[PDB]
Amino acid sequence: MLSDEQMQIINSLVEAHHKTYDDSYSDFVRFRPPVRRLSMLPHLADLVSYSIQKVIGFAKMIPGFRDLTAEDQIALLKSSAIEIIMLRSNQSFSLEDMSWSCGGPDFKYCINDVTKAGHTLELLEPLVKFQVGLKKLKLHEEEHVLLMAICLLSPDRPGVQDHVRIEALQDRLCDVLQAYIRIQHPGGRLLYAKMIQKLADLRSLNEEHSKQYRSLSFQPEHSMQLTPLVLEVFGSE
Template sequence: MEMAVSTSSQAQDEFDRNVPRICGVCGDKATGFHFNAMTCEGCKGFFRRSMKRRATFTCPFNGSCNITKENRRHCQACRLKRCLEIGMMKEFILTDEEVQRKKDLIQRRKEEEALREAQRPRLTEEQQNIITTLLEAHHKTYDDSYQDFSRFRPPVREGPVTRSASRAASLHSLSDASSDSFSHSPESGDSKVNLSNLLMAYQEQGSSPDSAEDDGSRLSMLPHLADLVSYSIQKVIGFAKMIPGFRDLTAEDQIALLKSSVIEVIMLRSNQSFNLEEMSWSCGSPDFKYCVNDVTKAGHTLELLEPLVKFQVGLKKLNLHEEEHVLLMAICLLSPDRPGVQDHARVEALQDSLCEVLQAYIRVNHPGGRLLYAKMIQKLADLRSLNEEHSKQYRQLSFQPEHSMQLTPLVLEVFGGQVT
């Protein structure tokens, strides 16, 4: 066995450039650098045996035989001469003791690697199943092309805003958000949306046509973004219902968790459509591309938008795996300290289980990410303040009749406004 190293940087460069690997002795296919030259296995072995035996060969001809793959055994003298001419060196040949030490070293490294592999952290089958379930839930309720949103009220970035035929248009014509289907059952009479019915029966509530037009309001984007938020709420509900353990909670706790966390989950989800270079959100077609200025035309002020953009940038720079992203959304939703939650212990147990899965996933897939979990949990704290400011600004809008008419009933109910 030889020490397969090259003392020539030029030779190594040739090897790295994947030039044809031809044996410099006989022209056969080479297997690498052996004793400082590119050779085949046959010539490698011949040189090693010749040097170790200190063999002396004599050419039966004139000492200038042309060595080829077919005749390389015919003249050992010229073959050895050719080995030396291309730079093969006997100094590179290991002694028997060195060969044994090298074998022992290789074996020891294999054993150490096997031990490291055995000790490497792994996800349990249950943890992997939880991740698989959450990924499936996310894929069923999140479409980055937003194809089923294209039928709603279009964005109007300037000029007067014309109302759509239904102020609850965002609650109609939705594609399925999960394996369950939304059932369309317009409520007779008024246009009230009940989150409890929406969650438990997974139904949408309609509204009667309204053809009134807004004045030339500065809030030209409000109708469109209200539809987008309603659409997103529907999708988050679909995601929540597939989180392991969520359906086992009481209806009251499910509603309390959703009402208080839904905007935070929406903000987490929107990070997938956030473009770090352009500092904007792209939701499918070019028409559904939103910058900060667009959001200000929906009534939101910089008190919300500045920390929101900062949050989106920070989250994007964490470069989370999709598995980490869906786990963070589920952990966010299952927070036991949400207002109105009754069974704190049960919700906390579900959240703790998800936190353990997230930490295990990070240990397995981000060995160097010791601080990643802490950074992710800090993002949940940041979301709380964003949630508070968002709800405050929506409540202010809902208390103004000319603006509340642009909001969908579901948005009004979830964010504290009164639906009459």
């Protein structure tokens, strides 16, 4: 059985997701259009910038996050934003088409659509391999959300100052996930282990993106196309 408190964490983490993810992708029309030089760069920056806004809404609703100091919240966020984005992006990734399908044919993002925004297959290849490996796991909603909140609360990120408290927080969430799979997932298996394997991949994808972002952000004709939010989060200050 799960304790009353562990089901409250599950209740409130699932609801936080539903408030911050729109299965209709309707706000995509408010972005700058995509063009198919780095022609896809405006529209993706607007897209990621919007997602950062949603990750911050989700994070404000993880039990315990609201109570860390302001510096710790920012350091966690700056270091894990790109990985949470890769995680929530799994919900729109279709196994067929091998593309992110956000509704219409303009928001179908093949791998060629991403290269026209400054990235190379040295990142896109492991990214897509990550997206099918996650898709084949067939996670429940409650598992997907737990995975996100755990990746956020990792202590081993640059800039944290209260490891003991954020690690205590992360460990309470591992416990809830393990308990969920035991009681509520059939056969049990090593789902928990394949899930924790996926965390170690995001560390490697994080690093690649940050290298390629640095090259883009040094070229003033490309940083000009970013949003203020993107520059604040993926910058070093």
